């Protein structure tokens, strides 16, 4: 499920003891995999073939001792003795018996605090709660005061704006009377200067 | 109104005066301001009020001017910029006499309206 | 860890050309005096010597078997140190999330130095506040000014050194009976005979004890061209 | 929006009738330009600067815990002036959740 | 080393040679000259004067000076 | 070493140092302009050397925009604090960071050398063809500087974008401000390069894009498609700084952090689609004009949300804290000043109002209030906030109420009268003018000399 | 009181402009010969050899700090066992008078106070809505005027005369129909 199923690292075997894939340029040697499968047998077929680990029989008594001392480990050891342990079975055994590292808080040295100070812990917590109570209430109080004040700014900005509305209103009245009554408006007055 | 209706666990001062106290102060000198309104050497702690005796949560308010001059100081004991005055003395007065507050505010607004309208028109 | 890159070939095993050529002294060196490469090959030679002797395994105790393979029997002191080491490494490229810290159980902030920058985000949900950064110096029980979350600095320090897997192994593991070279030779003859070498490490190791070039094919194995 | 930590009335009940709010000064002190001694060389003036860091200061409460110099952003957490290499040990942003696992506890 | 902890340690520890500051100010001064010197040069090139006399491109009274 | 250093914090200092140096040349040019405009007549530039004035205004604009404010707000403060705000050891691309500052310096040397050696002519900082393509070699040199500057800007933008991959903490508003400016650069710069290459082709390769049957209005579209995003690439870092200063100095958590962030994103998208409000008087189609006018007015919405969120940050802050620090004053002054500049921007946004106010000193005052006042003050405020971290000294700025007051008063004396002459009307990019506009021009000139004098008192 | 007088003694007024004698009177450019100061100049600044000419980052004076066991020297905490518990005493910074000079007395009182937060979620949400939609309303109030004035400029009018205006460098040419 990673890298397309290609293992990042894998074992390759060569039949010729003096073979070097970098020095030689021959075209007859066929590499094998970790289980010994020749490269010309595709993965889809070889992965179906069942491969099991065979330990020398002299190890059976040791594998038996392991099972008895740890009964949860016995089924895996039995498979290994009987030549029924595949790579997947080995992986299941490996991860089943892995445990996490443990941290003990009782071993941590503590920052220095006198016995007088240690007896005041409840008092300091009490002060902290009252500070949080006063903080939360003040938030409501302040929000009401300042957002209400912003209305004064709206009203002040509406008064000052209305002053320019009135000036504009009077301006339009004046403009309507310019071409109609204003003596400043003159017709048949400007004469062409002519080219210099 | 924080002490009056919202929070009952802060000390509540008495209003010495609804007007600021004018005092000459000198740079490099530390002044102590009465936060309870019961000192007889206003605006300063007299050594006999609540602030001086550290009674009922009242403590003197330390203050120091940057430059020499005449500075306004809070008499209402609730100004936001206490010990200095910023107008909270008038605001607190309006809370206590809302009818008077309206009269002054109307008069101030009336003058402001006339002048701004007279000049712009 | 997610922050680590891909396993190297060396992460699995080392090339036999990195085996120290003075095997006789290697197997007699105390653990505290063995370097990384020397310690790798001491454990591999001794561990594989016991594992490749099937008839003796059932009578060997787990304490002795673990010693031969170089595995450290765990105890509360070493577990604590190793655990805090792995927690430090994990936090290098991972988020720092856990239970709310109190006086009884402060937030544990591992560090190598005497200080580490830490941020408090408050509690869960509405009790979460904006990041408040502070410098967590050793020897003080810190309290957030906002949520009153208690913090504490834990230092990975031991005897003028910080905590490492190598330090933990050296401080707590005790060297057992000196490795006997007769066992190496005995196992060597067991799995290596008549041009068949089924213990390559023990064929090279025995060759070095013999003086380098003594065993068949070993002169040819050691002759390189570049 | 954030409005402080929630408080239950039970947590506001004092253990004595004289308990009031602790009056500890959170003004760190009087400061100015860091003043180096002439006698100190470059190395010893560096030590002097490192000993004048406000962000290494704190206020100790009545129970022995200390409230440190805190900031909204990590810009105020490096030595002033900023050294060449600042965050060698990655600063840890602590998140809180209610999840727990059994391995952490012992009965 | 303690000397290498702070970037620009000599300046931050107030031991730097003042010449560094002088060069910085000189560099800024030279940058400023790139706006004034070509102004004078161009004025002379096209007029023969380094700088004009206020309103000398317009008609002036007889007593103007 | 000095030039080899890759330290991101050292490079940040270099950016500020170079901005001040190049800034001296910028301010000098501004003094030349205002001196000339003091009355009608020739004052310091001969009538036969009017080409120099055209070059002065062109270089003033280009240098202040691309070599001073952009290197200062997008290169200086960002390179110093961004990796710290991101709780990362250093910047993602160390070697690229070094070359960027070197590139800026090399392009500056090319520009100033072109003043000294080439004939001095000008075509505005907007390099409109066909005027730009019928000029002398000084225009070619300026084009090389801009292209070289573009390289530094884009690589620096790439550098900041990579912080998303490594950031170990929370993306604060300021970090969001830089990231979005970086995005705006990545999308706008490639278009600028193309149109600049076409200017070169017509100047140097006998191309015919900007001669009859080729539309000169084409340049204005592609130029301003970068032009207006540029004005927000120059202001957004300033907004990020303002947010940090107000929250820190008032000890108040940012209110509406997500709305601040989403306001910055919104301004960027909108700023990428409103460029033709610079082309109202060319004669575009009615529907195009209405689209651009409509979308231009929309930008006020997100910009307005940020302003009000800043105001509530300063409201309610403790009175005991001293409020006369220069950084706090500058941050507050930014809100007061930016509103003036933005509102006038909305006025000019109405195209019919714009017909009267295009190419007049009203436009000048508009973008000066935002850049020459707002952006400068924001950069000063940001540097001032980081005085302890940066560690500079030998100046009297941190607590100097005289400097702030004098600067605010005199800067307004310069540009407030330029709004008035906009309706009189006095065109831009001119040196001679009618005698009935002297009063206001004289007042602004008195303001310019005074501001320069106040810059000497800091030392 | 005047706090400057407390540490006046420490501040001895200087003799040399910029704190250095003429190079002739003392050569501060040379490296110091004092043992253990080979990386410093005589005046205490770092020598160019140490920082530039033979900088260790360039491969000069190669000296790996880490030892064989992958360890570096680390200074331990001040540990104090007590009351059946191992304690660590933190390092407290020196008095600010030593580092800054002013005597740490008569400090103004700044009490602990939790962050000043805005409350009343419902009220705050309404304000934020207004912070966004009050500008939106104003824009909408300008939109209709903008459309109308744009339509007005682009109105098909029954023009009866044409004046052609050409702009050249630097004059304006005007072409007008001549009366018949
Ligand atoms: C009765 C008195 C009023 C009379 C008139 C009333 C008119 C009707 C108004 C509506 C009704 C209001 C009724 C209020 C009743 C009281 C309510 C209450 O809660 O009382 C307690 C409450 C406070 O009590 P508290 O909380 O106990 O604290 C007491 C303190 O006094 C704390 O006090 P405070 O903090 O509230 O102090 C008030 C202060 C609070 O505010 C401030 O102090 C802020 C000041 C910021 C200044 C920043 C610098 C600006 C510089 C700009 C320079 C620009 C130059 C370049 C221009 C270029 C242009 C091209 O207000 C001001 O300073 C006034 C600011 C006015 C607007 C400024 C801008 C004007 C622009 C004009 C147009 C410009 C056009 C060109 C520019 C471009 C345009 C796009 O009192 C008030 O609310 C009082 C409000 C008084 C307002 C007076 C305004 C006078 C000037 C008007 C002009
Ligand atoms: C906008 C303005 C106002 C702003 C107001 C607001 C400001 C607010 C605050 C802002 C703060 C920003 C952040 C600051 C961070 C500072 C960090 C720092 O200090 O870093 C350490 C850094 C270096 O310290 P370090 O670590 O000790 O470095 C040791 C060296 O690496 C190694 O030492 P070394 O001694 O071995 O050094 C080598 C040295 C060796 O030096 C020597 O041997 C020097 C010998 C003496 C030469 C003196 C000049 C001679 C000139 C002759 C001219 C003749 C003209 C003749 C004309 C004839 C006409 C007929 O130099 C060289 O070899 C190369 C020098 C290159 C640079 C100088 C270039 C000058 C101009 C050249 C123009 C050429 C044009 C050619 C055109 C050709 C056309 C064909 O500091 C500096 O570099 C100095 C910075 C000083 C200012 C800091 C900021 C203070 C606050 C602001 C004050 C206001 C400034 C306003 C702007 C300037 C106005 C003018
Ligand atoms: C296929 C055929 C091929 C054929 C091939 C044929 C051959 C082809 C060859 C092609 C290549 C040729 C070029 C080779 C370049 C080699 C570079 C290299 O590897 O150098 C290593 C070499 C390392 O030196 P080193 O041997 O280890 O010894 C270093 C020293 O002992 C001390 O260490 P250091 O690193 O500190 O020394 C440098 C440092 C020494 O001085 C300092 O430490 C300075 C302290 C600060 C003083 C105040 C500075 C002013 C304020 C600046 C603020 C902004 C800073 C911006 C960022 C930094 C800019 C440098 O500063 C300087 O000397 C220059 C400072 C300039 C500051 C900016 C001035 C702006 C003025 C604006 C008006 O680099 C250097 O140290 C020097 C590099 C100099 C490059 C100069 C480029 C200048 C370009 C100017 C414009 C050109 C066009 C117009 C010219 C018009 C003329 C009239
Ligand atoms: C950083 C610099 C900067 C900034 C932020 C802006 C911001 C804006 N600018 Fe720009 N502008 C320039 C720099 C800048 N400008 C420059 C340099 C030029 C000239 C280039 C040249 O021609 O050579 C220019 C030119 C320019 C013109 C050309 C006029 C002409 O050519 O005749 C126009 C018109 O559309 C315009 C509009 C705007 C608008 C509508 C905004 C908006 O961003 C403003 C938004 C802000 C506000 C609106 C105020 C804050 C918001 C509120 C208070 C909410 C309430 C307000 C409302 C509901 C309206 N600008
Ligand atoms: C951000 C860019 C910027 C800045 C700061 C300024 C600053 C100033 N400008 Fe600006 N100006 C432009 C950009 C800028 N200008 C542009 C783009 C044009 C149009 C170009 C064109 O028409 O083609 C223009 C045009 C322009 C003209 C029009 C000339 C014309 O075309 O007819 C005039 C004079 O009236 C003028 C005057 C000034 C003055 C008097 C100042 C200032 O001197 C006012 C006083 C303020 C200061 C002296 C402080 C400035 C300090 C710094 C910038 C350094 C900051 C560095 C740090 C904080 C590290 N400018
Ligand atoms: C008519 C009246 C005219 C009045 C003109 C008044 C001008 C006043 C100018 C003031 C300049 C101030 C310069 C200054 O402060 O420099 C500071 C700066 C740094 O010093 P410190 O800050 O002390 O740093 C050391 C550690 N602290 O000092 C320097 O670098 C000194 C540099 C001096 C350079 C002087 C160069 C002068 C060149 C003149 C050229 C004139 C050309 C004229 C051409 C005419 C053609 C026709
Ligand atoms: C008009 C022509 C414009 C030509 C511009 C060319 C360069 C465009 C940008 C390329 C990409 C830059 C970038 O971010 O690449 C990073 C990467 C380097 O990263 P480091 O700094 O080493 O960081 C280490 C991280 N572990 O860039 C390179 O390798 C750039 C190599 C070529 C130089 C490009 C920049 C300088 C301009 C060259 C112009 C010719
Ligand atoms: C990043 C965001 C990029 C948005 C690109 C598209 C924005 C289009 C806005 C709508 C403008 C509009 O109305 O288009 C007309 C307008 C031209 O109008 P007139 O000159 O009047 O010609 C019309 C027929 N005579 O179109 C343009 O100029 C658009 C130019 C192309 C922009 C393409 C950008 C691609 C970026 C990738
Ligand atoms: O440009 O706005
Ligand atoms: Cu625009
Ligand atoms: K003139
Ligand atoms: Zn009292
Ligand atoms: Zn009062
Ligand atoms: Zn917290």
């Amino acid at each position: 499920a990673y890298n397309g199923g290609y293992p990042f690292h894998y074992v390759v075997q060569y039949d010729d003891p003096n073979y070097d894939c970098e020095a030689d340029f021959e075209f007859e040697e066929i590499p094998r995999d970790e289980f010994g499968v020749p490269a010309h047998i595709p993965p889809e077929l070889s992965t179906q073939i069942r491969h099991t680990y065979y330990v020398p029989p002299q190890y059976y008594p040791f594998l038996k001792k392991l099972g008895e001392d740890t009964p949860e480990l016995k089924p895996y050891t039995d498979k290994l003795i009987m030549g029924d342990m595949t790579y997947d079975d080995y992986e299941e055994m490996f991860y089943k018996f892995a445990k996490p590292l443990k941290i003990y808080r009782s071993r941590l040295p503590l920052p220095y605090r006198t016995d007088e100070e240690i007896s005041q812990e409840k008092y300091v917590n009490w002060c902290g709660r009252w500070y949080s109570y006063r903080q939360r209430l003040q938030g409501d109080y302040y929000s009401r005061h300042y957002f209400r004040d912003w209305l004064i700014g709206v009203m002040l900005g509406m008064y000052l704006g209305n002053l320019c509305v009135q000036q504009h209103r009077q301006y339009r009245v004046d403009m309507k009377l310019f071409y109609l009554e204003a003596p400043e408006h003159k017709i048949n007055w400007v004469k062409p200067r002519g080219d210099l | 109104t924080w002490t009056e209706i919202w929070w009952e666990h802060d000390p509540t001062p008495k209003v010495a005066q609804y007007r600021p106290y004018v005092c000459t102060v000198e740079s490099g000198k530390v002044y102590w301001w009465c936060a309870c309104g019961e000192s007889k050497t206003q605006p300063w702690v007299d050594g006999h009020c609540k602030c001086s005796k550290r009674e009922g949560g009242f403590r003197p308010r330390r203050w120091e001017p940057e430059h020499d001059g005449v500075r306004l100081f809070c008499g209402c004991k609730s100004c936001f910029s206490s010990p200095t005055w910023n107008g909270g003395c008038f605001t607190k007065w309006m809370q206590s006499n809302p009818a008077g507050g309206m009269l002054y505010c109307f008069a101030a607004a009336f003058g402001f309206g006339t002048l701004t309208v007279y000049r712009k028109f | 860890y997610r922050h680590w890159h891909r396993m190297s070939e060396d992460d699995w095993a080392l090339p036999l050309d990195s085996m120290p050529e003075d095997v006789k002294t290697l197997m007699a060196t105390p653990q505290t005096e063995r370097g990384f490469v020397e310690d790798y090959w001491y454990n591999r030679i001794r561990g594989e010597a016991t594992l490749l002797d099937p008839e003796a395994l059932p009578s060997k105790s787990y304490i002795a078997l673990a010693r031969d393979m170089g595995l450290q029997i765990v105890d509360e002191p070493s577990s604590h140190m190793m655990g805090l080491i792995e927690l430090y490494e994990y936090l290098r490229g991972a988020s720092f999330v856990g239970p709310f810290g109190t006086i009884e159980n402060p937030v544990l902030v591992p560090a190598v130095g005497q200080e580490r920058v830490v941020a408090c985000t408050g509690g869960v949900g509405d009790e979460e506040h904006f990041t408040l950064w502070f410098r967590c110096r050793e020897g003080f029980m810190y309290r957030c000014g906002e949520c009153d979350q208690i913090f504490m600095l834990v230092r990975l320090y031991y005897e003028d050194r910080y905590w490492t897997q190598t330090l933990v192994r050296d401080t707590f593991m005790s060297d057992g009976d000196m490795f006997d070279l007769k066992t190496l030779e005995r196992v060597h003859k067991m799995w290596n005979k008549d041009e068949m070498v089924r213990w390559e490490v023990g064929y090279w190791a025995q060759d070095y004890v013999l003086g380098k070039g003594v065993l068949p094919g070993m002169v040819e194995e050691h002759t390189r061209v570049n | 929006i954030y409005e402080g930590q929630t408080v239950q009335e039970s947590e506001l009940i004092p253990q004595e009738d004289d308990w009031v709010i602790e009056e500890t000064n959170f003004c760190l002190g009087r400061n100015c330009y860091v003043r180096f001694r002439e006698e100190d060389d470059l190395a010893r003036r560096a030590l002097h600067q490192m000993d004048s860091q406000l962000n290494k200061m704190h206020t100790r409460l009545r129970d022995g815990t200390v409230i440190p110099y805190m900031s909204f952003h990590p810009d105020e957490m490096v030595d002033r002036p900023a050294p060449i290499h600042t965050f060698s040990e990655k600063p840890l942003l602590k998140w809180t959740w209610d999840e727990t696992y059994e391995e952490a506890y012992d009965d | 080393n303690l000397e290498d902890h702070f970037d620009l340690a000599e300046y931050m520890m107030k031991m730097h040679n003042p010449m560094s500051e002088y060069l910085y100010w000189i560099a800024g001064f030279v940058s400023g000259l790139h706006g004034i010197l070509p102004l004078l040069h161009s004025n002379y090139y096209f007029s023969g004067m380094f700088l004009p006399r206020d309103n000398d491109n317009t008609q002036l009274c007889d007593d103007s000076w | 070493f000095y030039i080899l250093v890759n330290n991101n914090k050292r490079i940040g200092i270099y950016y500020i140092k170079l901005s001040i140096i190049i800034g001296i040349l910028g301010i000098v040019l501004s003094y030349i302009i205002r001196v000339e405009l003091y009355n009608s007549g020739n004052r310091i530039i001969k009538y036969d050397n009017v080409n120099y004035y055209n070059m002065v205004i062109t270089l003033h604009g280009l240098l202040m925009i691309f070599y001073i404010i952009m290197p200062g707000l997008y290169g200086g403060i960002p390179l110093y604090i961004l990796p710290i705000l991101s709780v990362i050891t250093d910047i993602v691309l160390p070697r690229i960071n070094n070359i960027s500052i070197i590139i800026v310096l090399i392009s500056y040397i090319v520009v100033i050398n072109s003043i000294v050696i080439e004939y001095n002519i000008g075509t505005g900082w907007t390099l409109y063809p066909p005027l730009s393509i019928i000029g002398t070699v000084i225009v070619n040199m300026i084009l090389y500087g801009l292209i070289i500057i573009g390289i530094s800007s884009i690589i620096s933008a790439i550098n900041f974008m990579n912080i998303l991959i490594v950031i170990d903490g929370i993306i604060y508003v300021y970090i969001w401000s830089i990231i979005i400016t970086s995005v705006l650069l990545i999308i706008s710069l490639p278009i600028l390069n193309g149109i600049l290459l076409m200017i070169l082709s017509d100047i140097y390769f006998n191309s015919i894009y900007f001669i009859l049957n080729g539309d000169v209005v084409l340049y204005q579209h592609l130029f301003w498609y970068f032009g207006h995003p540029e004005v927000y690439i120059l202001i957004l870092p300033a907004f990020g700084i303002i947010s940090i200063i107000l929250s820190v100095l008032n000890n108040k958590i940012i209110f509406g952090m997500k709305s601040m962030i989403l306001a910055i994103i919104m301004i960027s998208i909108l700023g990428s689609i409103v460029w033709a409000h610079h082309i109202y008087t060319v004669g575009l189609e009615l529907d195009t004009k209405i689209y651009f006018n409509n979308l231009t007015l929309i930008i006020s919405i997100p910009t307005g949300n940020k302003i009000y969120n800043w105001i509530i940050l300063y409201i309610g802050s403790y009175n005991i804290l001293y409020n006369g620090y220069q950084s706090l004053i500058f941050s507050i002054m930014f809100i007061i000043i930016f509103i003036i500049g933005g509102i006038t921007g909305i006025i000019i946004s109405i195209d019919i109002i714009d017909i009267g106010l295009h190419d007049t000193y009203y436009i000048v005052s508009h973008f000066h209030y935002i850049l020459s006042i707002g952006a400068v003050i924001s950069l000063l405020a940001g540097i001032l906030l980081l005085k302890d971290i940066i560690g500079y000294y030998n100046v009297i700025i941190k607590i100097n109420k005289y400097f702030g007051l004098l600067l605010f008063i005199n800067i307004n004396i310069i540009f407030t009268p330029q709004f008035i002459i906009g309706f009189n009307v006095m065109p831009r990019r001119i040196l001679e003018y009618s005698d009935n506009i002297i009063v206001w021009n004289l007042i602004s000139s008195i303001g310019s000399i005074s501001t320069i004098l106040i810059l000497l008192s800091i030392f | 009181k005047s706090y400057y007088d407390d540490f006046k003694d420490r501040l001895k007024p200087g003799k040399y402009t910029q704190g250095r004698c003429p190079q002739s009177e003392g050569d501060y450019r040379q490296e110091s010969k004092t043992i253990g100061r080979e990386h410093l100049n005589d005046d205490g600044t770092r020598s160019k050899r140490y920082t530039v000419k033979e900088a260790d980052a360039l491969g000069y004076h190669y000296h790996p700090p880490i030892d064989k066991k992958g360890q570096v020297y680390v200074k331990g905490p001040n540990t104090v066992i007590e009351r059946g518990q191992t304690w660590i005493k933190g390092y407290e910074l020196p008095s600010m008078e030593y580092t800054y000079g002013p005597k740490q007395e008569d400090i103004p009182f700044y009490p602990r106070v939790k962050l000043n937060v805005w409350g009343n979620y419902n009220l705050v949400m309404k304000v934020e809505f207004l912070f966004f939609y009050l500008p939106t309303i104003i824009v909408f109030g300008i939109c209709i005027p903008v459309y109308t004035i744009n339509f007005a400029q682009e109105e098909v009018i029954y023009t009866t005369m044409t004046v052609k205006v050409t702009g050249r460098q630097w004059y304006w040419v005007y072409e007008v129909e001549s009366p018949t």
Side-chain angles (χ1 to χ4, degrees), chain E residues 14-31:
Chain E
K14 315 215 171 183
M15 303 173 61
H16 69 283
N17 189 284
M19 180 56 53
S20 311
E21 308 204 14
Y22 293 140
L23 292 172
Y24 181 75
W25 282 73
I26 288 292
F29 175 74
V30 173
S31 79

Side-chain angles (χ1 to χ4, degrees), chain C residues 23 39 52 62 87-88 94 106 124 164 223:
Chain C
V23 175
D39 183 70
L52 297 174
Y62 288 108
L87 177 59
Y88 187 104
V124 309
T164 64
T223 174

Side-chain angles (χ1 to χ4, degrees), chain C residues 31-172:
Chain C
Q31 177 169 335
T32 60
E33 302 179 5
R34 292 197 299 267
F36 288 103
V37 182
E38 303 180 359
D39 183 70
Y40 176 89
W41 284 106
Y42 179 90
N43 294 330
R44 187 170 180 184
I45 291 169
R46 184 168 188 173
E48 288 173 331
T50 178
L51 293 178
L52 297 174
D53 188 2
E55 300 177 0
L57 292 173
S59 62
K60 190 176 296 303
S61 63
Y62 288 108
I63 291 293
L65 175 55
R67 178 66 262 190
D68 290 358
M69 289 179 310
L71 309 181
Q72 173 177 0
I73 304 283
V74 317
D75 48 65
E76 168 168 359
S78 57
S79 177
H80 177 242
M81 280 169 83
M82 289 305 323
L84 275 163
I85 287 163
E86 303 311 299
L87 177 59
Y88 187 104
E89 180 61 26
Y90 175 79
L91 293 175
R92 282 185 55 202
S95 296
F96 192 48
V97 55
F100 194 78
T102 183
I103 278 276
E104 184 178 281
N105 295 286
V107 179
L108 303 183
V109 177
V112 179
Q114 299 82 13
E115 193 179 48
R116 188 162 188 178
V117 181
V118 183
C120 182
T121 51
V124 309
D126 296 356
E127 288 188 355
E128 183 186 345
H129 57 72
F130 192 90
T131 56
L132 294 180
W133 290 96
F134 72 101
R135 293 224 268 182
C136 187
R137 310 193 297 102
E138 57 169 357
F140 300 105
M141 191 83 98
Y142 287 99
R143 181 192 297 275
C144 175
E146 191 56 37
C147 66
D148 292 344
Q149 181 165 210
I150 281 79
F151 284 82
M152 181 179 65
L153 191 80
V154 179
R155 282 197 64 195
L156 321 182
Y157 159 86
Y158 178 81
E159 299 188 356
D160 302 329
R161 295 163 294 176
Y162 67 104
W163 295 355
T164 64
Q165 169 258 13
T166 314
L167 182 282
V168 172
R169 288 172 54 74
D170 291 358
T171 51
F172 297 110

Side-chain angles (χ1 to χ4, degrees), chain F residues 87-268:
Chain F
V87 284
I88 52 175
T89 48
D90 64 344
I91 287 288
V92 169
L93 307 177
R95 285 191 270 276
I96 291 285
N97 203 19
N98 179 37
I99 204 177
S100 56
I101 182 61
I102 303 167
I103 287 163
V104 173
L105 174 59
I106 286 300
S107 37
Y108 172 66
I109 295 163
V110 168
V111 167
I112 64 187
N113 287 0
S114 85
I115 304 168
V116 168
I117 70 186
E118 310 292 354
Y119 284 110
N120 297 329
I121 64 107
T123 65
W125 87 273
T126 58
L127 304 174
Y128 274 19
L131 187 67
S132 63
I133 61 166
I134 64 172
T136 71
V137 177
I138 194 165
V139 180
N140 309 34
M141 291 273 262
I142 289 161
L143 290 169
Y144 301 146
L146 297 174
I147 296 169
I148 292 169
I149 279 287
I151 299 172
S152 60
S153 59
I154 184 64
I155 63 180
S156 57
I158 292 171
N159 210 341
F160 293 145
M161 292 295 308
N162 295 325
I163 288 179
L164 290 169
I165 304 177
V166 300
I167 183 172
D168 296 333
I170 297 177
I171 311 167
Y172 298 96
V173 171
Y174 181 73
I175 307 180
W176 273 112
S177 97
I178 303 179
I179 295 170
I180 296 172
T181 57
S182 303
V183 174
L184 284 168
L185 284 161
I186 291 162
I187 65 180
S188 63
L189 288 164
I191 301 305
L192 174 63
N193 297 352
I195 193 60
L196 294 181
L197 298 175
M198 295 316 102
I199 295 293
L200 282 172
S201 66
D202 281 54
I203 286 170
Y204 198 78
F205 296 90
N206 303 268
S207 188
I208 54 172
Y209 285 116
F210 305 114
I211 192 163
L212 257 183
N213 208 45
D215 201 345
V216 174
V217 183
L218 188 160
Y219 169 89
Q220 304 177 19
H221 283 278
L222 278 70
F223 171 86
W224 285 118
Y225 181 83
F226 166 85
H228 184 82
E230 176 64 17
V231 309
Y232 291 101
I233 287 158
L234 294 156
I235 199 69
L236 289 181
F239 292 165
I241 303 170
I242 291 290
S243 60
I244 282 177
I245 294 174
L246 291 177
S247 59
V248 167
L249 299 186
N250 302 325
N251 294 346
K252 293 188 62 180
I253 292 174
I254 180 64
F255 214 65
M257 194 197 324
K258 303 295 145 196
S259 62
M260 293 301 227
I261 299 157
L262 288 166
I264 302 153
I265 303 173
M266 189 66 19
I267 293 171
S268 74

Side-chain angles (χ1 to χ4, degrees), chain G residues 54-87:
Chain G
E54 299 182 354
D56 47 330
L58 278 55
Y60 293 82
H61 304 287
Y62 178 64
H63 183 266
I66 303 171
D67 64 355
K68 301 179 179 181
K69 292 292 187 176
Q71 284 289 348
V72 297
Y73 173 73
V74 174
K75 189 181 295 183
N78 182 19
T79 62
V80 179
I81 197 171
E82 236 180 74
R83 293 168 284 167
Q85 178 65 226
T86 58
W87 311 87

Side-chain angles (χ1 to χ4, degrees), chain D residues 3 25-27 29-30 32 35 41 48 51-52, chain G residues 3 7 37 91 99-100 104-106 108 110:
Chain D
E3 303 176 3
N25 197 345
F26 272 61
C27 188
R30 311 176 89 98
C32 50
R35 294 188 199 277
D41 72 317
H48 190 282
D51 286 322
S52 65
Chain G
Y3 288 82
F7 59 95
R37 296 180 147 270
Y91 163 78
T99 53
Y100 296 97
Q104 302 303 305
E105 62 181 4
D106 187 9
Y110 184 84

